[PDB]
Write a protein that binds this DNA or RNA. Structure first.
Ligand SMILES: [Mg+2]
Ligand SMILES: [Mg+2]
Ligand SMILES: [Mg+2]
Ligand SMILES: [Mg+2]
Ligand SMILES: [Mg+2]
Ligand SMILES: [Mg+2]
Ligand SMILES: [Mg+2]
Ligand SMILES: [Mg+2]
Ligand SMILES: [Mg+2]
Ligand SMILES: [Mg+2]
Ligand SMILES: [Mg+2]
Ligand SMILES: [Mg+2]
Ligand SMILES: [Mg+2]
Ligand SMILES: [Mg+2]
Ligand SMILES: [Mg+2]
Ligand SMILES: [Mg+2]
Ligand SMILES: [Mg+2]
Ligand SMILES: [Mg+2]
Ligand SMILES: [Mg+2]
Ligand SMILES: [Mg+2]
Ligand SMILES: [Mg+2]
Ligand SMILES: [Mg+2]
Ligand SMILES: [Mg+2]
Ligand SMILES: [Mg+2]
Ligand SMILES: [Mg+2]
Ligand SMILES: [Mg+2]
Ligand SMILES: [Mg+2]
Lengths: 186, 51, 126, 142, 234, 103, 144
RNA sequence: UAGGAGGGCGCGGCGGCCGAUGCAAAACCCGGGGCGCGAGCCCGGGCGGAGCGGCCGUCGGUGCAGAUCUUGGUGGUAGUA
RNA sequence: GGCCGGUACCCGCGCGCCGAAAGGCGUGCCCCUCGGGGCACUGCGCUGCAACGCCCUGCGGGCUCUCCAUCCGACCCGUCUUGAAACACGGACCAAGGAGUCUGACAUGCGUGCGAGUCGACGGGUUCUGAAACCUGGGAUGCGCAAGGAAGCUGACGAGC
RNA sequence: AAAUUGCCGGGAGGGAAGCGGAUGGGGGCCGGCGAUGCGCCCCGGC
């Protein structure tokens, strides 16, 4: 008998290989296993750990934010382990070099017609294996519509969480608990 | 061009050697052990050999 | 046809793990079923009652699935898959499957004698 | 393989026509691969005869005494199955078979990986033919 | 071809570089063993110097009319004697902080008002006292394990200390033993490096663990007699 | 009810299992309509298979006011001004809708 | 995929995963939303605030058509004009956009605009859409 | 324990792949030999006399010792009342 | 004396001799100065401890199978229960059937496709084994891209630490 | 097929039997249950 919690065995969990059995993703996984093992670059470590992500932990990043992130850093290669969607709200995109999993077929055309070069992670591993002069990025995680529902309950003070409502309107959860004149103001 | 040198060397756990009564190992842990023992014995030598 | 295993096969238990109370009844099969009772002396593991299978009774990985022959068995239905044990005859043992004909068994055994593959069924169906 | 070898492996590492798997998917699983151009017939990416450009086969020939075929895949002709394998019917004795196999596998840096395994299979095939000729003179158990 | 010759060039470079590292490290070990020899010689010399010094002082005080009060011990050896069952939660925390998380573990402790009043709170569960040189050294030798990268690495060679310490000017087992016993400026690190000694059950038995050592039992101070107990825990 | 979820609106308190309508006959209606269209085309050969002519009209309703669609028939004013008699227009493949007004 | 349902793993465990003490009876809380005001009160007034009661005035025979205002922000207007007729333009000459031809009634004023002038021709405009278009040098033509 | 999850074993189909079978398939019986910690599997012998299995994907009316469970059979009571 | 282990690394062996062998044998510097002791220059390689038995178709060896004896243990399972072996309830035994499934809405999590789009789901044209498959519309059908108000109505002028 | 019954052969029983762990004594059954082959050599031809 020894005084330990669950015999000391780690009770947290993390991904160690993507649930996705996409063969191309498994091949990237093997490549970056090699790189993080023989190279000891923290950048490769982060890239690996982020290929071991779900699609709700890999939200899309659009150019209207990518260009923000590339404004004055055209020498460094942009890396987004996720998706690049276009954004019809921007007009002039600097010729930028971005590496990503996927490019929406209109965003890839936008980048090519702007004159940048549009990479995949193997092409990234060619000319930045340790990640020389690279700019790692993540898309907005808590921007997902589902997240607007999370946190402390809708009906407690100071909470600004969207309650699950089957439709908007006057009759759908406006009456008692949302105003002084019927009951109380949440 | 960037990988560190490959490491094929497998280091297993080393068998235990008696750290108190194995001469070879006690002289790798405490190299002065033999000198202290010799001093003590060579001090006993006179203390007995006198009488 | 000489065994490659160079480690003595050790078994932490040879007796089977018969189901608790398989003895008093006939309808209960001998196969093990974990006793799910709330007051079951077997589940509470009082001494003197049947032993359950743990993982602790597991056998060594390097001496696992070796027959008493010191070969791992591999069941073959025909000459086609008999012949693919050329470079495993020191570690794998063919067994001709239970539903082949005696005619095909003669052929497989003849083929295995010249490929020098240990077979435990060469005296079957004759 | 029009696609690369690693991709072919990730495509066929779990099911293919040449894979004989028995005893379930538990710790008891036994896996062999029975394509002609796999040497140990061990189903691994080293020995896989489908996921590789450069593969060697060592087989006893058709009904005829003591003729061994050594075949190596032609890397460049690879999308031409009829002209995909360079097959080599040799019938000389064993020492000159081993020198030629070393010539075709290891010495030209075709695929030194399978230097020792190809020769081991050559020994097994040769003595298999030798005993098909002579008979069971030795019990081969000591 | 070019591919394999290019591979082999680096293979040659690495072979040479590894050989020259071995050549350097042989000289390193050859000088380091003389350094260790010197340190152990002087540690032993001051062991006898202090041992004669105590008798010298006590005799001098008796001669000059008064008496010499020995300097109270700087170090405690604590060994837990009660199991992990039926513990008040505050006591459970005290033991988890002292690193006594299993019966018949031994830890080395600084003496100070912070820690000795911590033992005060948990005396029914530990037996503890004043280790001497033999006890400390042979604990370190025969049951020495090091908290190396959270793993328990046996202290079977001098090299483990190069990794665990060496930012603290502790290089051999004898430095570790000295720097514990004569509670040093780095005792915290050279104890947290040590893994709780997992000791044998007391040979020859054990008196009643329910009572205090004064009343006949075993818990609490037995100041000098942890020495007498260790030879049968070890 | 239990953990945070929408307030259910299950309208399954009647005997809905007596009125479930399954669509396994969807391919069957497709094929039957196709057959009916062939056997109408052969009969009305050589008339146009879409039927008589239909007017360009505007939809109602602010949401679709700008979106033109085929109506039901030409008005009397339109037939008269295009020079085609009322009773003859439906004869020669021209629908007539006496209810529409030309505004 | 019944071969995956966790009921299958709960075979042999007497309670099928619903507890021995508190069993799995028909409807121990009531059918549906039973007792919103009474014993599910904690639930309804924690997670669905505002559920109970009337607010607002009735509107007999609503048509959703009457309320149809598809809107477009200013930031997206320039996507509507093709690049060719963005080139066929200068400082004094600017393209004219009929949003009603695109299915939009109102033109709202969210986001940036390029400095290039544009004449958006809508049915409804906001204050801020006009202020941004004028400040960009364009103009507005109201049609319907 | 209540409970949760992972990995597997097993039954019956479907889309595929590899096979077995009148020189004996399925089933069932055995003081037969084994493998796995275990669900279970493999082989041997007998009866049997025409079908059957393995692997991958996938699907399901899929696993029994209880429910005074349902149908059918059989006991002890008993050669007794 | 007990138990375990028997070596690709710590040990050990060869590259000299004597010695069956344990093993002994060189040179130079420090120490006592007797006896001897300490230190030193150090390199290539190789590197699974042995001796002898017994039996080998035997009346042999061993077996996880069967019966029996003996020592130790050992209350009858499922269950409601703080508590069941209970003088709590169900169960005489066997065989077969036998209990979280289907559908709708929603939600989180995960996978796939696309991604300010996305759905072809009602229809239409095709469809030479086919209730399949493939094509088609959509310029606004569903959801999403704008929200706040009861409503008239208004509807995000561009972020720093 | 089992429940269940009979006959034959075996086994054991001082107010239960059955089951777990030890071996021991009976059985019954296992030749992949357990080997005879490697190197060196000389012919005698293959
Ligand atoms: Mg333990
Ligand atoms: Mg309030
Ligand atoms: Mg209980
Ligand atoms: Mg004793
Ligand atoms: Mg006592
Ligand atoms: Mg007490
Ligand atoms: Mg009803
Ligand atoms: Mg449970
Ligand atoms: Mg549940
Ligand atoms: Mg229940
Ligand atoms: Mg409940
Ligand atoms: Mg209750
Ligand atoms: Mg009330
Ligand atoms: Mg069922
Ligand atoms: Mg059943
Ligand atoms: Mg039953
Ligand atoms: Mg049950
Ligand atoms: Mg009660
Ligand atoms: Mg009672
Ligand atoms: Mg009751
Ligand atoms: Mg009863
Ligand atoms: Mg749309
Ligand atoms: Mg910041
Ligand atoms: Mg019977
Ligand atoms: Mg009697
Ligand atoms: Mg017994
Ligand atoms: Mg026995």
């Amino acid at each position: 008998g020894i005084d330990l919690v669950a015999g000391g065995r780690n009770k947290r969990t993390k991904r160690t290989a993507p649930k996705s059995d996409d063969v191309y993703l498994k091949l990237l996984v093997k490549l970056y296993r090699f790189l993080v093992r023989r190279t000891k670059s923290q950048f490769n470590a982060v890239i690996l750990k982020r290929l071991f992500m779900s699609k709700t932990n890999r939200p899309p990043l659009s150019m209207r934010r990518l260009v923000r992130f590339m404004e004055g850093k055209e020498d460094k290669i942009a890396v987004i382990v996720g998706t690049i969607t276009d954004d019809q709200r921007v007009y002039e995109i600097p010729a930028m070099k971005v590496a990503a999993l996927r490019f929406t077929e209109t965003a890839r055309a936008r980048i090519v017609n702007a004159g940048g070069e549009c990479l995949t992670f193997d092409q990234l591993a060619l000319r930045a294996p340790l990640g020389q002069n690279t700019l790692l990025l993540r898309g907005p995680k808590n921007a997902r519509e589902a997240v607007r529902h999370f946190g402390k309950a809708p009906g407690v003070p100071h909470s600004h969480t969207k309650p699950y409502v089957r439709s908007k309107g006057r009759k759908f959860e406006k009456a008692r608990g949302r105003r002084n004149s019927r009951g109380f103001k949440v | 061009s960037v990988v560190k040198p490959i490491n094929k060397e497998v280091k297993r756990r080393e068998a235990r050697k008696n750290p108190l009564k194995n001469a070879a190992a006690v002289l790798k842990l405490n190299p002065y052990f033999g000198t202290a023992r010799r001093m003590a014995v060579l001090a006993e030598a006179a203390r007995v050999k006198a009488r | 046809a000489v065994p490659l295993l160079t480690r003595k096969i050790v078994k932490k238990r040879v007796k089977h793990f018969k189901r608790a109370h398989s003895d008093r009844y006939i309808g209960l099969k001998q196969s093990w079923r974990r006793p799910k009772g709330i007051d079951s002396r077997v589940r509470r593991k009082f001494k003197g009652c049947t032993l359950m299978p743990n993982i602790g009774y597991g056998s060594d990985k390097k001496t696992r699935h070796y027959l008493p022959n010191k070969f791992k068995k591999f069941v073959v239905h025909n000459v086609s898959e008999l012949e693919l044990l050329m470079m495993h005859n020191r570690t794998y043992c063919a067994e001709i499957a239970h539903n082949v004909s005696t005619k095909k068994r003669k052929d497989i055994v003849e083929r295995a004698a010249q490929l020098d593959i240990v077979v435990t069924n060469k005296l079957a169906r004759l | 393989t029009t696609v690369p070898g690693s991709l072919v492996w990730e495509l066929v590492k779990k099911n293919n026509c040449f894979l004989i798997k028995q005893f379930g998917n538990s710790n008891a699983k036994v896996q062999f691969s029975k394509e002609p151009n796999n040497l140990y017939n061990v189903h691994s990416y080293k020995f896989s005869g489908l996921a590789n450009s450069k593969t060697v086969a060592v087989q006893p020939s058709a009904g005829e005494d003591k003729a061994v075929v050594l075949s190596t895949t032609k890397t460049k002709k690879q999308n031409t199955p009829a002209k995909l394998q360079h097959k080599t019917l040799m019938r000389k004795e064993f020492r000159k078979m081993a020198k030629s196999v070393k010539n075709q596998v290891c010495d030209n840096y075709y695929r030194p990986d399978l230097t020792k395994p190809a020769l081991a299979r050559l020994s097994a095939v040769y003595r298999s033919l030798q005993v098909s000729k002579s008979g069971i003179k030795k019990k081969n158990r000591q | 071809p070019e591919k394999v010759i290019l591979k082999r060039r680096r293979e040659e470079v690495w072979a040479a570089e590894k050989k020259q590292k071995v050549a350097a490290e042989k000289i390193k070990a050859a000088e380091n063993t003389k350094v260790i020899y010197a340190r152990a010689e002087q540690y032993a010399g001051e062991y006898e110097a202090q041992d004669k010094e105590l008798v010298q002082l006590k005799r001098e005080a008796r001669m000059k009319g008064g008496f010499y009060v020995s300097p109270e011990a700087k170090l405690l050896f604590v060994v837990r004697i009660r199991g992990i069952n039926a513990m008040h939660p505050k006591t459970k925390k005290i033991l988890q902080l002292l690193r006594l998380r299993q019966i018949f573990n031994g830890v080395f402790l600084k003496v100070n008002k912070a820690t000795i009043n911590m033992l005060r709170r948990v005396e029914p569960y530990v037996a503890y006292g004043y280790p001497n040189l033999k006890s400390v050294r042979e604990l370190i030798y025969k049951r020495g394990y090091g908290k190396l990268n959270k793993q328990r690495i046996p202290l079977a060679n001098n090299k483990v200390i190069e990794e665990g310490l060496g930012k603290h000017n502790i290089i051999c087992i004898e430095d570790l033993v000295h720097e514990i016993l004569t509670v040093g400026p780095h005792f915290k690190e050279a104890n947290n490096f040590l893994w709780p000694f997992k000791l044998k059950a007391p040979l020859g038995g054990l008196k009643k663990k329910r009572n205090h050592y004064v009343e006949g039992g075993d818990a609490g101070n037995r100041e000098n007699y942890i020495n007498q107990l260790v030879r049968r825990m070890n | 009810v239990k953990h945070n979820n929408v307030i259910p609106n299950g309208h399954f308190k009647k005997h809905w299992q007596n009125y479930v309508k399954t669509w396994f006959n969807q391919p069957a209606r497709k094929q039957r309509r196709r057959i009916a269209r062939q056997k109408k085309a052969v009969k009305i050969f050589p008339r146009p298979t879409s039927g008589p002519l239909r007017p360009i009209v505007q939809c109602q309703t602010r949401k679709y006011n700008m979106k033109a669609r085929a109506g039901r028939g030409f008005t009397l004013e339109e037939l008269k001004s295009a020079g085609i008699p009322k009773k003859l227009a439906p004869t020669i493949g021209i629908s007539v809708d006496h209810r529409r007004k030309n505004r | 995929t019944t071969r995956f349902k966790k009921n299958r793993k709960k075979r042999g465990h007497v309670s099928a995963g619903h507890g021995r003490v508190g069993k799995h009876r028909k409807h121990p809380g009531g059918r549906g939303n039973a007792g919103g005001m009474h014993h599910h009160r904690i639930l309804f007034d924690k997670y669905h605030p505002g559920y109970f009661g009337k607010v607002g005035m009735r509107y007999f025979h609503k048509l959703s058509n009457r309320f149809y205002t598809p809107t477009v922000n200013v930031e997206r207007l320039w996507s509507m004009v093709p690049s060719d007729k963005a080139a066929e333009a200068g400082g004094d000459k600017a393209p004219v956009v009929d949003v009603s031809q695109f299915g939009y009634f109102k033109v709202l004023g969210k986001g940036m605009l390029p400095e290039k002038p544009i004449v958006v021709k809508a049915k409804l405009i906001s204050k801020i859409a006009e202020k941004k278009i004028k400040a960009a040098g364009g103009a507005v033509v109201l049609v319907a």
